[PDB]
Amino acid sequence: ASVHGTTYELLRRQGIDTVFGNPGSNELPFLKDFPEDFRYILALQEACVVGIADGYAQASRKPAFINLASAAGTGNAMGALSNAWNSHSPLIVTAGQQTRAMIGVEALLTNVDAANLPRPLVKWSYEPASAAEVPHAMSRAIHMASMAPQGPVYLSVPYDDWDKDADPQSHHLFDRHVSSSVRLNDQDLDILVKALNSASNPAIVLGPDVDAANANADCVMLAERLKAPVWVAPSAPRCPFPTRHPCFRGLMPAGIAAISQLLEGHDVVLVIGAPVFRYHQYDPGQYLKPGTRLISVTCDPLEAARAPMGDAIVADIGAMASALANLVEESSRQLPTAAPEPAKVDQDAGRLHPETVFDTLNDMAPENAIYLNESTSTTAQMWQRLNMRNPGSYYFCAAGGLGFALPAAIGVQLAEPERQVIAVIGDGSANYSISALWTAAQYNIPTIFVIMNNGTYGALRWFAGVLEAENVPGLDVPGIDFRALAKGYGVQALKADNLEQLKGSLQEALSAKGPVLIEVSTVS
Amino acid sequence: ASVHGTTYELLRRQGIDTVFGNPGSNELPFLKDFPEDFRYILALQEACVVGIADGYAQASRKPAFINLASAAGTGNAMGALSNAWNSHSPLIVTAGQQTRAMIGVEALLTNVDAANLPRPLVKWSYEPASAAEVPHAMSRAIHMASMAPQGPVYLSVPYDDWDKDADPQSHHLFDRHVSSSVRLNDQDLDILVKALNSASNPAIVLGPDVDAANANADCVMLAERLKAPVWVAPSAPRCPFPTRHPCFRGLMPAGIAAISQLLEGHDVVLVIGAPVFRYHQYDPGQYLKPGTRLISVTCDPLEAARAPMGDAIVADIGAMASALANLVEESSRQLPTAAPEPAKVDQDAGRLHPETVFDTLNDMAPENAIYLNESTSTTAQMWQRLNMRNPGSYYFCAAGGLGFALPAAIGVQLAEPERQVIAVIGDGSANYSISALWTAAQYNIPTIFVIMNNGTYGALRWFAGVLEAENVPGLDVPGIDFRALAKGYGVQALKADNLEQLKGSLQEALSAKGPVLIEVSTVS
Amino acid sequence: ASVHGTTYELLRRQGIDTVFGNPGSNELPFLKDFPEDFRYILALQEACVVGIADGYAQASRKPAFINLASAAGTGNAMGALSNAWNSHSPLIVTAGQQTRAMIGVEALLTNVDAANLPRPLVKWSYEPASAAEVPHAMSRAIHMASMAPQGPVYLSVPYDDWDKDADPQSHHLFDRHVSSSVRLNDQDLDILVKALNSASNPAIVLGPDVDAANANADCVMLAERLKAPVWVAPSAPRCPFPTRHPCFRGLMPAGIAAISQLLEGHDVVLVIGAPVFRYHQYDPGQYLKPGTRLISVTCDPLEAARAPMGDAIVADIGAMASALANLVEESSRQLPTAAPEPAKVDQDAGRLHPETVFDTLNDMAPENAIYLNESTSTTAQMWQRLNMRNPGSYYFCAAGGLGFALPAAIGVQLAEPERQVIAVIGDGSANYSISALWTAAQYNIPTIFVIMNNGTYGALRWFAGVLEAENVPGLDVPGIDFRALAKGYGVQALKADNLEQLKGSLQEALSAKGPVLIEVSTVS
Ligand SMILES: Cc1ncc(Cn2c(C)c(CCOP(=O)(O)OP(=O)(O)O)sc2=O)c(N)n1
Ligand SMILES: Cc1ncc(Cn2c(C)c(CCOP(=O)(O)OP(=O)(O)O)sc2=O)c(N)n1
Ligand SMILES: Cc1ncc(Cn2c(C)c(CCOP(=O)(O)OP(=O)(O)O)sc2=O)c(N)n1
Ligand SMILES: [Ca+2]
Ligand SMILES: [Ca+2]
Ligand SMILES: [Ca+2]
Ligand SMILES: [Ca+2]
Ligand SMILES: [Ca+2]
Ligand SMILES: [Ca+2]
Ligand SMILES: [Ca+2]
Ligand SMILES: [Ca+2]
Ligand SMILES: [Ca+2]
Ligand SMILES: [Mg+2]
């Protein structure tokens, strides 16, 4: 067998059947003879390729396979890899290299010092030293991406390797099963459970790895048993809990002082599947107030090591959440009271308040909708106004890198064809990965894109305000016609300049057969 | 509090009380006001510093703390770090940096791009961006070294940081407990146990992480219950099993074909705490023969990913070995028969056969002796001839890097003052870290060093022979007087030119109050 | 032809005929069939291998070729590479890698991510992607080491590559000539010359790249023409000027304020072949005083970029010094007056003052002696007391990394068999690379080693004093018998406990046929 044939067999045997890519010449020997049982999803720029794959992996809860065009293609994707690193997304990023005989002279398309290129944003990065090693290296890549803590990996392959003979002993790779589905030993788990049972006023904080593990329901049971309020850890990349459950308390503000104040009076705070914590703004003060003990369960040693406070346990989130939910006592304390209904912001017949948009989406979208957020000045309101009952219902750029949501929404929609995906994206953010729209059109992936157009980088204007920073350039983005961009890439386009038009456009979009972009005129 | 005071409090609270070091000017502000409850162990060269610390950490089963002199000191230690990486040794390697105001100009002793220096041989490498971050960075270093898979880490600290004010909120670091003591979830563990119970002819292979976890006794119970022969994985850095237990089958040869042949007919092979596998020689063939399934339990994702065959489970070795030992059924198969007595090699009244040396050591050493091996051509015979009943009884350079055993034997002896350490080191190997002898003399650490002097790099002569490689230079090391070297560093020195002298010298050494070096004239 | 044959032909054609090494198994296929016209110089530890090669390269003014044992051997050499980077030493560091078929599984002796290991201390680091690339990669290594700014490079070669067929087109590599012997364009050079001619009180500062270029005599002419005092740049790795020439002003103290004060009143300061500047101690103040302009000529862009003041020209030091010396006008100013005779320190019949040692060496050593310094507390006095008339007469660890001088003195002596090498090394420093002594004995390289034994790390005690740092551990190194160490490695050993014995021992050493070590009892 060839390296090509063996590698595709390995991929298939390991459950991979889709290649997200933008091709180049070093990849043609890999992509030729493309298997009939595989899917290739083309995108027009590599940030888009990787964003789509990332959404697909996050929603599918399985690795996604990517093929990029040597160094330039890899490089174009590195912002997308920054997000994937923070979301623990299991991405197998492959790129073609020059033929081995031309690497030394640094022929055009040689990826120099290739393994160092995507560092430090990958868990493992490698170029094999021979053709026959390629299937083994691919096996390593699959497993490295997939073991907890999951994350992106990089493999560079000289294009002449594919046609070479494989090692027959590579057949041992095909059916390897590698598990990291582990939990704390019984003795220490019993100690933890006793501490939770004995807490007088516990609180729970959940991060994205809960949703990635589909541990959401177990966390609901845990919160009900402990009668504990539940927050989502700051800068949330995913939604780990039903947002109208009575225990839910919403998104934590991303500040040191704000979080210790929120946790004041809680004697034990159990954090599951989050860094401790993904703060953002400068908000100095106490990490925790006196009387609060924090215990973190994380899938990532790097998270456990860097937490500035608390105990930590490094284990699989699904295994731990299930064990804890089934072991803790039912507290006789009263169940927390549900958060009040959000206020309705006054809305005239002109430009839309973002709150109006979210309320309308919540009114009109199906109960199993999936939202993506890259409307950076409106996140807090979005989190308050969308009832997200189910797992896998929310994604936000995990490293804060714009250009995620537009392509990721396409990948999520590909992963979840029965769940309507609605990406709410600011006018500024929409441009970073605008060409991803084409993939939705070409493959008829029926994502809805809601562009919040206020003509400015609003979140930056806000942050400049708190700085009292004057004379900052580059904050306004006037003069972008998103309906024309959608037309450019073959996506049906609608406008919403007021509330009646927003409702009309959403109705039309929700009943459409393909992707739809709605340009919403929002308040500045 | 100062950064200095806070950092030493963190170290003490995290169980660190000893600094292994060779000082330099960038470290003086760290080392000044050295706490009265800490120990400083000086060694004269940094390979020695790190080797001593490594032995101490491996034997103590806890992190060891190191302080080195900027880039040159770090650099001198990098061979030692190669071994530490392969042994999963929890080493906290710190080095001083120039004062922040002088880093830009690259003053003498500036460690340029410091974090990259020890890569790729460390789990984490870092220089803090401010003085107040230093205690937090130290906390990260401690935990990164200590979480499974354990390994060396590197922290570079500008020397002016120590006297600066610490963040009062660093007190939250002091008592953090971070656990990776995890095992496979119950459902999947039950599947594994059923596969082990149903095996008709199981075999077990154990690696160094068993001994590091002190899982040895649990592995004995597991082997007895399964009635399974037990091998030590190739290139063994430690001894994970009693070498005269009836199930023991010795050290696996480090070859692909040799290992699959040894495993032929075993339907399930359970590997615990080893890479799969640390082959060495070129020995092409089948990874496994038809009819053998391999299942690996490893603490290291990188091991699990790169195994060319088998299933894998990534978990703590102690937690897994204990669980498996207590869950498997007692097989009614007959217990394996003990290996036969090794042959006595004919020995005249002249130079010693290595087999004679090992037999004599086994006859005369206490039953709780600890051996170290850096006598590279004699390893197979050593493994056959020493009865090592207890855990922590054997160490060998885990990356094959010479210069480990001489200093490591000092660290092991410091860790285990009641267990006589005997380092068996070739004449070639002895030179790499010869100055470590001084530390044994200075601190009166009573290691015994047995130098196997055959005047040559024997293992290289052997490997050249199998290559039929002629005209290789540099293989002979005549003209080294090890008794004079020992005198040079203040260590009592004896000779053994024949068997009667070997016995006499060993008797004298075993009753000595300090370290002793015996130069043994061995056959060429 | 094989890769082996082609590579050795390339080396020979490029002027390389000596391999400095410590062998390992991955190197045996390279070292076999070793050419009869090549020399192999064995050393017993890799810091020693590289130090010897470094001295040889620095003194010979040509590249030196090194072969080390995979990752551990490379790692053991990294402190030595730190010095080589700072001295711009042209070192071609090669290491063997595992056979390509065993790299993926990370067999013992696999150098993982090999090219990253010696970073950031090398100019170029590489592992070829195929056997036929190896000669080309070797060519790259040779030229990268040799082009200005010269420095160490690293090449890792899988051991199976050597026996493979070479590309016949590799013959084009053999006779490539690559020049960086460049100087500033005429127009801009004329501007510089006019600025020098018009200076009213010029000063010159010279660094190690002057001596490396053998630009010393040109710099003498330049200083005579400009009637300018000449200093050696701080932390000097080499001696770039005759130390009893009337213009000579000695070693600059390595402090910001001290240097600007020394330069006060000099309107133009021309620095040649030095960083600006290799400061060490914290000595804050002005980089230059008002009225001083600095112009630097450096071979290294990294030096030019980081200078905090002055103009810079990046060019070959030999070409620039020759051009400037021949273009500047003869000033009618008076030639600077020679520095006064150093004082004779009172010396009783007991332990030696270091000043006495240097005065005696200066009295008894030949006029073409070569000195090495690793007696860290005595450098200033050494520089005042040795008349070094010729180029290539002084070496000191360029990165401050101890363990350089003992092996480097052997390499220098090998390079300059007609010039007596005398290494003056502290008792502390002597231990780092002590085993290098064996190479001097084995190859009968007649270096003289003068060990300054004061029982302590004196320079650290001094630096602690200025810090008022109390309770620093690890500063004393009692109990080392250097005569026994010399005996250990087969080197003739003498003692000097007083002045009469020092004279007697030096007389005996200077007339000896082999290497000699003299242990001198110096004041504490
Ligand atoms: C790749 C990239 N570039 C720039 C930014 C900086 N950035 C920018 C440019 C923001 C403004 C986004 O504007 P928007 O129109 O999408 O939404 P708002 O008007 O609601 O802020 S928010 C923010 O962090 C970024 N995070 N990521
Ligand atoms: C740091 C380093 N350098 C070189 C080697 C190469 N090496 C060398 C030099 C060996 C010979 C050791 O000789 P010895 O006298 O200690 O023992 P034997 O004579 O029993 O082989 S075995 C081997 O792998 C190495 N492994 N590590
Ligand atoms: C490899 C390494 N380790 C440690 C040091 C720190 N160091 C040490 C240990 C010095 C003392 C050397 O003592 P010596 O006996 O050789 O000479 P003096 O007594 O004259 O200082 S000077 C100094 O910078 C270093 N520069 N390089
Ligand atoms: Ca509503
Ligand atoms: Ca799906
Ligand atoms: Ca906007
Ligand atoms: Ca016996
Ligand atoms: Ca102990
Ligand atoms: Ca030997
Ligand atoms: Ca004199
Ligand atoms: Ca010469
Ligand atoms: Ca000294
Ligand atoms: Mg490095």
Side-chain angles (χ1 to χ4, degrees), chain B residues 22 108 279 431-432 438 478 488-489, chain C residues 22 108 279 431-432 438 478 481 488-489:
Chain B
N22 180 267
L108 197 72
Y279 305 114
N431 304 292
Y432 291 81
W438 184 83
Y489 289 124
Chain C
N22 180 267
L108 197 72
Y279 305 114
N431 304 292
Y432 291 81
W438 184 83
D481 178 347
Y489 289 124

PDB file of all heavy atoms in Angstrom, chain B residues 22 108 279 431-432 438 478 488-489, chain C residues 22 108 279 431-432 438 478 481 488-489:
ATOM      1  N   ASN B  22      24.656  25.434  41.920  1.00  0.00           N
ATOM      2  CA  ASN B  22      25.988  25.992  41.735  1.00  0.00           C
ATOM      3  C   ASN B  22      25.768  27.487  41.530  1.00  0.00           C
ATOM      4  O   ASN B  22      25.055  27.854  40.611  1.00  0.00           O
ATOM      5  CB  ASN B  22      26.719  25.327  40.572  1.00  0.00           C
ATOM      6  CG  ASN B  22      28.084  25.893  40.369  1.00  0.00           C
ATOM      7  OD1 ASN B  22      28.274  26.822  39.569  1.00  0.00           O
ATOM      8  ND2 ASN B  22      29.050  25.402  41.127  1.00  0.00           N
ATOM      9  N   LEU B 108      26.800  41.164  30.093  1.00  0.00           N
ATOM     10  CA  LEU B 108      27.299  39.866  30.463  1.00  0.00           C
ATOM     11  C   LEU B 108      26.344  39.214  31.458  1.00  0.00           C
ATOM     12  O   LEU B 108      25.841  39.854  32.348  1.00  0.00           O
ATOM     13  CB  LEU B 108      28.689  39.999  31.076  1.00  0.00           C
ATOM     14  CG  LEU B 108      29.489  38.700  31.128  1.00  0.00           C
ATOM     15  CD1 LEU B 108      29.945  38.291  29.758  1.00  0.00           C
ATOM     16  CD2 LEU B 108      30.663  38.865  32.096  1.00  0.00           C
ATOM     17  N   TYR B 279      12.739   1.164  22.341  1.00  0.00           N
ATOM     18  CA  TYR B 279      13.663   0.383  21.547  1.00  0.00           C
ATOM     19  C   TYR B 279      14.970   1.137  21.430  1.00  0.00           C
ATOM     20  O   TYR B 279      15.018   2.343  21.673  1.00  0.00           O
ATOM     21  CB  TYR B 279      13.085   0.148  20.167  1.00  0.00           C
ATOM     22  CG  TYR B 279      11.718  -0.497  20.087  1.00  0.00           C
ATOM     23  CD1 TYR B 279      10.627   0.211  19.594  1.00  0.00           C
ATOM     24  CD2 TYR B 279      11.513  -1.816  20.448  1.00  0.00           C
ATOM     25  CE1 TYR B 279       9.399  -0.371  19.438  1.00  0.00           C
ATOM     26  CE2 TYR B 279      10.280  -2.410  20.270  1.00  0.00           C
ATOM     27  CZ  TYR B 279       9.219  -1.693  19.759  1.00  0.00           C
ATOM     28  OH  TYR B 279       7.996  -2.277  19.563  1.00  0.00           O
ATOM     29  N   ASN B 431      33.852   9.798  33.870  1.00  0.00           N
ATOM     30  CA  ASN B 431      34.435  11.107  33.654  1.00  0.00           C
ATOM     31  C   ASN B 431      33.440  12.203  33.431  1.00  0.00           C
ATOM     32  O   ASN B 431      33.744  13.377  33.723  1.00  0.00           O
ATOM     33  CB  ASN B 431      35.386  11.062  32.483  1.00  0.00           C
ATOM     34  CG  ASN B 431      36.410  10.013  32.705  1.00  0.00           C
ATOM     35  OD1 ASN B 431      37.253  10.142  33.600  1.00  0.00           O
ATOM     36  ND2 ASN B 431      36.329   8.937  31.949  1.00  0.00           N
ATOM     37  N   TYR B 432      32.257  11.876  32.916  1.00  0.00           N
ATOM     38  CA  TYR B 432      31.349  12.934  32.478  1.00  0.00           C
ATOM     39  C   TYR B 432      30.991  13.876  33.614  1.00  0.00           C
ATOM     40  O   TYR B 432      30.966  15.098  33.404  1.00  0.00           O
ATOM     41  CB  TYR B 432      30.085  12.355  31.819  1.00  0.00           C
ATOM     42  CG  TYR B 432      30.345  11.685  30.490  1.00  0.00           C
ATOM     43  CD1 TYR B 432      30.829  10.390  30.420  1.00  0.00           C
ATOM     44  CD2 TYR B 432      30.154  12.351  29.295  1.00  0.00           C
ATOM     45  CE1 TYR B 432      31.077   9.793  29.207  1.00  0.00           C
ATOM     46  CE2 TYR B 432      30.424  11.771  28.072  1.00  0.00           C
ATOM     47  CZ  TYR B 432      30.895  10.487  28.031  1.00  0.00           C
ATOM     48  OH  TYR B 432      31.174   9.837  26.857  1.00  0.00           O
ATOM     49  N   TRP B 438      33.010  15.317  44.796  1.00  0.00           N
ATOM     50  CA  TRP B 438      33.279  16.299  45.836  1.00  0.00           C
ATOM     51  C   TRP B 438      32.076  16.522  46.740  1.00  0.00           C
ATOM     52  O   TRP B 438      32.217  16.737  47.941  1.00  0.00           O
ATOM     53  CB  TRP B 438      33.687  17.620  45.192  1.00  0.00           C
ATOM     54  CG  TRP B 438      34.074  18.652  46.171  1.00  0.00           C
ATOM     55  CD1 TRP B 438      35.298  18.799  46.768  1.00  0.00           C
ATOM     56  CD2 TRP B 438      33.244  19.688  46.693  1.00  0.00           C
ATOM     57  NE1 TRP B 438      35.278  19.867  47.621  1.00  0.00           N
ATOM     58  CE2 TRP B 438      34.039  20.439  47.584  1.00  0.00           C
ATOM     59  CE3 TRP B 438      31.923  20.060  46.493  1.00  0.00           C
ATOM     60  CZ2 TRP B 438      33.553  21.538  48.271  1.00  0.00           C
ATOM     61  CZ3 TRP B 438      31.451  21.144  47.185  1.00  0.00           C
ATOM     62  CH2 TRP B 438      32.254  21.872  48.062  1.00  0.00           C
ATOM     63  N   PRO B 478      42.459   4.960  27.748  1.00  0.00           N
ATOM     64  CA  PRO B 478      43.524   4.523  28.660  1.00  0.00           C
ATOM     65  C   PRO B 478      44.007   5.656  29.550  1.00  0.00           C
ATOM     66  O   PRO B 478      43.862   6.823  29.252  1.00  0.00           O
ATOM     67  CB  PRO B 478      44.654   4.160  27.696  1.00  0.00           C
ATOM     68  CG  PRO B 478      44.455   5.114  26.536  1.00  0.00           C
ATOM     69  CD  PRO B 478      42.955   5.107  26.368  1.00  0.00           C
ATOM     70  N   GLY B 488      41.599  13.416  44.660  1.00  0.00           N
ATOM     71  CA  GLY B 488      41.416  14.786  44.243  1.00  0.00           C
ATOM     72  C   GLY B 488      40.203  15.446  44.865  1.00  0.00           C
ATOM     73  O   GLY B 488      40.250  16.612  45.237  1.00  0.00           O
ATOM     74  N   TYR B 489      39.108  14.701  44.960  1.00  0.00           N
ATOM     75  CA  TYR B 489      37.867  15.222  45.517  1.00  0.00           C
ATOM     76  C   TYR B 489      37.563  14.785  46.936  1.00  0.00           C
ATOM     77  O   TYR B 489      36.485  15.100  47.447  1.00  0.00           O
ATOM     78  CB  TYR B 489      36.703  14.958  44.553  1.00  0.00           C
ATOM     79  CG  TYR B 489      36.775  15.835  43.308  1.00  0.00           C
ATOM     80  CD1 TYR B 489      36.790  15.307  42.036  1.00  0.00           C
ATOM     81  CD2 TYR B 489      36.858  17.205  43.428  1.00  0.00           C
ATOM     82  CE1 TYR B 489      36.873  16.137  40.916  1.00  0.00           C
ATOM     83  CE2 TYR B 489      36.916  18.033  42.335  1.00  0.00           C
ATOM     84  CZ  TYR B 489      36.947  17.487  41.075  1.00  0.00           C
ATOM     85  OH  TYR B 489      37.025  18.312  39.982  1.00  0.00           O
TER      86      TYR B 489
ATOM     87  N   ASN C  22      33.267  13.390  21.121  1.00  0.00           N
ATOM     88  CA  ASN C  22      33.054  12.309  22.073  1.00  0.00           C
ATOM     89  C   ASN C  22      32.019  11.401  21.418  1.00  0.00           C
ATOM     90  O   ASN C  22      30.937  11.874  21.108  1.00  0.00           O
ATOM     91  CB  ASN C  22      32.614  12.838  23.435  1.00  0.00           C
ATOM     92  CG  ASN C  22      32.388  11.739  24.418  1.00  0.00           C
ATOM     93  OD1 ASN C  22      31.259  11.249  24.575  1.00  0.00           O
ATOM     94  ND2 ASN C  22      33.454  11.280  25.052  1.00  0.00           N
ATOM     95  N   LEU C 108      15.347   5.038  22.144  1.00  0.00           N
ATOM     96  CA  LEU C 108      16.459   5.583  22.877  1.00  0.00           C
ATOM     97  C   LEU C 108      17.452   6.217  21.908  1.00  0.00           C
ATOM     98  O   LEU C 108      17.726   5.685  20.861  1.00  0.00           O
ATOM     99  CB  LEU C 108      17.140   4.482  23.683  1.00  0.00           C
ATOM    100  CG  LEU C 108      18.050   4.981  24.801  1.00  0.00           C
ATOM    101  CD1 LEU C 108      17.249   5.551  25.935  1.00  0.00           C
ATOM    102  CD2 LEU C 108      18.962   3.840  25.262  1.00  0.00           C
ATOM    103  N   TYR C 279      28.625  45.405  29.359  1.00  0.00           N
ATOM    104  CA  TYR C 279      28.585  45.773  30.759  1.00  0.00           C
ATOM    105  C   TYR C 279      28.313  44.535  31.585  1.00  0.00           C
ATOM    106  O   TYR C 279      27.851  43.522  31.059  1.00  0.00           O
ATOM    107  CB  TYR C 279      27.487  46.791  30.992  1.00  0.00           C
ATOM    108  CG  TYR C 279      27.528  48.057  30.162  1.00  0.00           C
ATOM    109  CD1 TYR C 279      26.533  48.324  29.227  1.00  0.00           C
ATOM    110  CD2 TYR C 279      28.513  49.011  30.337  1.00  0.00           C
ATOM    111  CE1 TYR C 279      26.502  49.496  28.521  1.00  0.00           C
ATOM    112  CE2 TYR C 279      28.470  50.202  29.640  1.00  0.00           C
ATOM    113  CZ  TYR C 279      27.462  50.453  28.735  1.00  0.00           C
ATOM    114  OH  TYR C 279      27.401  51.638  28.051  1.00  0.00           O
ATOM    115  N   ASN C 431      37.101  22.932  38.095  1.00  0.00           N
ATOM    116  CA  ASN C 431      36.308  21.721  38.167  1.00  0.00           C
ATOM    117  C   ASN C 431      35.336  21.546  37.043  1.00  0.00           C
ATOM    118  O   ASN C 431      34.978  20.397  36.714  1.00  0.00           O
ATOM    119  CB  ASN C 431      35.559  21.671  39.477  1.00  0.00           C
ATOM    120  CG  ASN C 431      36.509  21.797  40.608  1.00  0.00           C
ATOM    121  OD1 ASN C 431      37.321  20.894  40.844  1.00  0.00           O
ATOM    122  ND2 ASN C 431      36.477  22.926  41.285  1.00  0.00           N
ATOM    123  N   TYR C 432      34.881  22.639  36.436  1.00  0.00           N
ATOM    124  CA  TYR C 432      33.771  22.524  35.492  1.00  0.00           C
ATOM    125  C   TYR C 432      34.104  21.594  34.339  1.00  0.00           C
ATOM    126  O   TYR C 432      33.252  20.782  33.948  1.00  0.00           O
ATOM    127  CB  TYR C 432      33.323  23.904  34.978  1.00  0.00           C
ATOM    128  CG  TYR C 432      32.664  24.761  36.034  1.00  0.00           C
ATOM    129  CD1 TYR C 432      33.413  25.478  36.949  1.00  0.00           C
ATOM    130  CD2 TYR C 432      31.289  24.827  36.157  1.00  0.00           C
ATOM    131  CE1 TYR C 432      32.806  26.243  37.916  1.00  0.00           C
ATOM    132  CE2 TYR C 432      30.669  25.571  37.140  1.00  0.00           C
ATOM    133  CZ  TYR C 432      31.433  26.277  38.028  1.00  0.00           C
ATOM    134  OH  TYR C 432      30.893  27.049  39.022  1.00  0.00           O
ATOM    135  N   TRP C 438      42.754  15.163  30.463  1.00  0.00           N
ATOM    136  CA  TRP C 438      43.103  13.891  29.848  1.00  0.00           C
ATOM    137  C   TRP C 438      43.490  14.050  28.385  1.00  0.00           C
ATOM    138  O   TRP C 438      44.373  13.356  27.884  1.00  0.00           O
ATOM    139  CB  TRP C 438      41.924  12.932  29.963  1.00  0.00           C
ATOM    140  CG  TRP C 438      42.218  11.581  29.450  1.00  0.00           C
ATOM    141  CD1 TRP C 438      42.847  10.567  30.123  1.00  0.00           C
ATOM    142  CD2 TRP C 438      41.914  11.075  28.152  1.00  0.00           C
ATOM    143  NE1 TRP C 438      42.944   9.463  29.323  1.00  0.00           N
ATOM    144  CE2 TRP C 438      42.368   9.740  28.116  1.00  0.00           C
ATOM    145  CE3 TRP C 438      41.302  11.608  27.028  1.00  0.00           C
ATOM    146  CZ2 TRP C 438      42.226   8.935  26.999  1.00  0.00           C
ATOM    147  CZ3 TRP C 438      41.174  10.803  25.926  1.00  0.00           C
ATOM    148  CH2 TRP C 438      41.631   9.486  25.912  1.00  0.00           C
ATOM    149  N   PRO C 478      36.407  24.069  49.636  1.00  0.00           N
ATOM    150  CA  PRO C 478      37.586  23.457  50.262  1.00  0.00           C
ATOM    151  C   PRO C 478      37.769  22.011  49.828  1.00  0.00           C
ATOM    152  O   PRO C 478      36.854  21.341  49.399  1.00  0.00           O
ATOM    153  CB  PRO C 478      37.214  23.465  51.744  1.00  0.00           C
ATOM    154  CG  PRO C 478      35.706  23.309  51.736  1.00  0.00           C
ATOM    155  CD  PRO C 478      35.297  24.209  50.595  1.00  0.00           C
ATOM    156  N   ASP C 481      42.251  18.528  45.819  1.00  0.00           N
ATOM    157  CA  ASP C 481      43.684  18.292  45.610  1.00  0.00           C
ATOM    158  C   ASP C 481      43.936  18.245  44.107  1.00  0.00           C
ATOM    159  O   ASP C 481      43.701  17.235  43.459  1.00  0.00           O
ATOM    160  CB  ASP C 481      44.102  17.007  46.318  1.00  0.00           C
ATOM    161  CG  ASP C 481      45.560  16.662  46.103  1.00  0.00           C
ATOM    162  OD1 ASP C 481      46.217  17.248  45.225  1.00  0.00           O
ATOM    163  OD2 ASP C 481      46.038  15.767  46.844  1.00  0.00           O
ATOM    164  N   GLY C 488      45.286  11.863  38.216  1.00  0.00           N
ATOM    165  CA  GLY C 488      44.154  11.107  37.732  1.00  0.00           C
ATOM    166  C   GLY C 488      44.069  11.054  36.222  1.00  0.00           C
ATOM    167  O   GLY C 488      43.733  10.024  35.652  1.00  0.00           O
ATOM    168  N   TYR C 489      44.356  12.178  35.574  1.00  0.00           N
ATOM    169  CA  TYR C 489      44.290  12.268  34.121  1.00  0.00           C
ATOM    170  C   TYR C 489      45.627  12.221  33.410  1.00  0.00           C
ATOM    171  O   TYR C 489      45.668  12.391  32.189  1.00  0.00           O
ATOM    172  CB  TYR C 489      43.438  13.474  33.705  1.00  0.00           C
ATOM    173  CG  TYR C 489      41.955  13.258  33.983  1.00  0.00           C
ATOM    174  CD1 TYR C 489      41.218  14.123  34.761  1.00  0.00           C
ATOM    175  CD2 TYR C 489      41.308  12.151  33.478  1.00  0.00           C
ATOM    176  CE1 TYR C 489      39.865  13.887  35.011  1.00  0.00           C
ATOM    177  CE2 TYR C 489      39.974  11.920  33.696  1.00  0.00           C
ATOM    178  CZ  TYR C 489      39.260  12.786  34.488  1.00  0.00           C
ATOM    179  OH  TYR C 489      37.930  12.546  34.724  1.00  0.00           O
TER     180      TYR C 489
END
